Design a protein around this ligand. Structure first.
Ligand SMILES: [Mn+2]
Ligand SMILES: [Mn+2]
Ligand SMILES: [Mn+2]
Ligand SMILES: [Mn+2]
Lengths: 294, 157, 294, 65
């Protein structure tokens, strides 16, 4: 497995010109996928987590931005982490990104957590860059190993029975948490239905209940959907990711939902900060921001 | 690691905190840490091509429904004794992303004498190079550059 | 194929602690093998070279010793090089060694030359380390790609019609240089015969003509064989490698044959220097020695 | 970190009996000796090579093909 050596090499580029690659061996990467997969399967698909915790949204292969997040948030295991998915695609360093994340999951399996995003799906990461990066840097067989691993990622987390976390958002079909718990893994993400919505849906201030999503997949939901969901489930907050937001975090339905996004100046096409939300032992939530310099 | 942060206006005071809410939101200033400028860290990616990726993918899905087998052919002065055609998916298949298929098997040639390769077989890999979702010219160039005992993966229904 | 980027990364470990790896992509390495095979096949199997030229013996995956050769001899294209084989096996970095050499071969095809050693042969480098390196760091299919490449390496060189160069030595079957020119590539190295002998034979002080070789392959040849071959072909010198010698170079049959060896403290089991022989445009030969410090 | 400062040693001796029609020459000039890594700075040993174990594996790969 060689884990500490793998982590050392991944972290060696701290202080290098951003964009510099870390090229692990194919066998090393395979080993990460295989062990992390075992771990994901041994833990619930709907995680039950306790504060203190730091929550991050999309990274999209922006490896040197991920390194900064750990530098300011505290490297595992000094802080506990929950990531909300979308580790791969768009960025040029999906491989370094996902390998470091999987390494820390393997090293600290009770204190480090990764959810599945819509890009942790073969039909999506085939097209938006992760397959290309695997093909160029390794081979297509390694991309298939990643798919097997991704297909076992948990889908949602509940923090101290009060914060519901998933990549996308709610589903018109979601009535009981048991509907999430009963999803068997490995699984692909379908084109429609509960699992799709959890990874794909968006809040929208201009829709009342449920509307159509401009992505051509899943739905949008309004502030009233959020209020009823939280009331039904005795929850305080939905934490999700999935949309670029200018300051890295953005509330919806008052403070009832928050969107987190952790890829600063997203794929060099947006001017946005990244952010993380810290939840302390007493459940005090705060935001720390990652802003590109001018 | 860079550890200096600035502070900005934090979250405003909430006017109506729901009655039995357990979580709290800090009003303290928000800490703002720095990461690289776009000049220092080019976060752009120009190589993402979703239309090319999709055509390749469809061909890969077809190949996975095939029976795959290895063939080794000793290349001689008369070449491999096959001719190839590229075929893609649908009427508007380009020239860019094709499957590569055996058009002819030359009598007395290496492919023929070996016995295994037949007309309409797909050539999936040659000497560890994938021929699934390539140009007919990429494929012809690869096969012409092959030498000695040439390794194929061949696909058949 | 990004040659300059490949060469940069292979050269970036200059000044690093020896033993540090350069991990290229599988595709970059396959591209090095395919491109260099085309060049090898477009050039004669018996090369006809013109001084100035620097001639080097075995490297055996001692990568940082290869870097030292170039640093003291001049990096291509500042100097012209001919290597006499045995790039892989025994050492821990056969991959970096062969990649750099192939890269330079592609980059400077008329100023940089590689002969086949007995270790550029699948049946040998299966068991002496190179297969293991490939399997560990890449995969077995990459190893077979190297075989395709090695099978097309030229076998011998003649410098300015006067210096006959090959890895091993002479053959009792060798009567005309045409017997070498007519060998078709790709080829494996047989267990016996002309092509075996060129890569495997050794000079011996104690043998008269042709003797038994302690290796269990090929033969030994004596001083008289050397004199006869030189007179027959109007040559002045045989330059070969294949045997570790204390000073990096060692004469035989007065100065009618020289053995060159370029891997200092050979696989940590010998105290020997490495050397190269420079031939200038006037056909003046000199030796430069690389000696491990105390 | 490469040591460009070579030391010079006595060169090759002058040959007494040079072959009649020889074209090549051998320099009598001092030989340059460059310093390279000691064994302490560069451990060139390889414990990983096991020719006996590799041969057995190989024999099974050949029986397969
Ligand atoms: Mn995203
Ligand atoms: Mn998303
Ligand atoms: Mn050797
Ligand atoms: Mn040898």
């Amino acid at each position: 497995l060689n884990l500490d050596s793998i982590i050392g090499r991944l972290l060696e580029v701290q202080g290098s010109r951003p964009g510099k690659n870390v090229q692990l061996t194919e066998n090393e990467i395979r080993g990460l996928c295989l062990k992390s997969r075992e771990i994901f399967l041994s833990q619930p698909i709907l995680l039950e987590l306790e504060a203190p915790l730091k929550i991050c949204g999309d990274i999209h292969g922006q490896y040197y931005d991920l390194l900064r997040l750990f530098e300011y948030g505290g490297f595992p295991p000094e802080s506990n982490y929950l990531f909300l998915g979308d580790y791969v695609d768009r960025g040029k360093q999906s491989l370094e990104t996902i390998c470091l994340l999987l390494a820390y999951k393997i090293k600290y399996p009770e204190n480090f957590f990764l959810l599945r995003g819509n890009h942790e799906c073969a039909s999506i990461n085939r097209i938006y860059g992760f397959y290309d990066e695997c093909k160029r840097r390794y081979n297509i067989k390694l991309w298939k190993t990643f798919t097997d691993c991704f297909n076992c990622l948990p889908i949602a987390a509940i923090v101290d029975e009060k914060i519901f976390c998933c990549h996308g958002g709610l589903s018109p079909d979601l009535q009981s948490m048991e509907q999430i718990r009963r999803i068997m893994r490995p699984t692909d993400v379908p084109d429609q239905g509960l699992l799709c919505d959890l990874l794909w849906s968006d809040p929208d201030k201009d829709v009342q209940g449920w509307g159509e999503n401009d992505r051509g997949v899943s739905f949008t939901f309004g502030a009233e959907v959020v209020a009823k969901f939280l009331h039904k489930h005795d929850l305080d907050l939905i934490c999700r990711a999935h949309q670029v937001v200018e300051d890295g975090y953005e509330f919806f339905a008052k403070r009832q939902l928050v969107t987190l996004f952790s890829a600063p100046n997203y794929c060099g096409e947006f001017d946005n900060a990244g952010a993380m939300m810290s939840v302390d032992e007493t459940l005090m939530c705060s935001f720390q921001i990652l802003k590109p310099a001018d | 690691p860079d550890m200096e942060y600035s502070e900005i206006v934090g979250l405003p005071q909430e006017e109506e905190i729901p009655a039995n809410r357990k979580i709290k939101f800090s009003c303290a200033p928000i800490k703002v840490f720095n990461t690289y400028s776009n000049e220092d860290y080019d976060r752009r990616n120009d190589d993402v091509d979703p239309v090319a990726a999709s055509a390749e993918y469809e061909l890969e899905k077809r190949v996975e429904k095939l029976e795959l087998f290895p063939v080794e052919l000793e290349k001689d002065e008369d070449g491999l004794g096959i001719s190839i055609i590229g075929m893609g998916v649908g009427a508007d298949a380009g020239l860019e992303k094709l499957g590569i298929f055996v058009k002819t098997v030359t009598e007395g040639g290496a492919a023929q004498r070996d016995g295994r390769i037949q007309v309409n077989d797909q050539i999936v890999e040659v000497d560890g190079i994938s021929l699934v979702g390539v140009t007919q010219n990429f494929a012809a160039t690869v096969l012409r550059n092959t030498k000695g005992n040439v390794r194929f993966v061949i696909g058949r229904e």
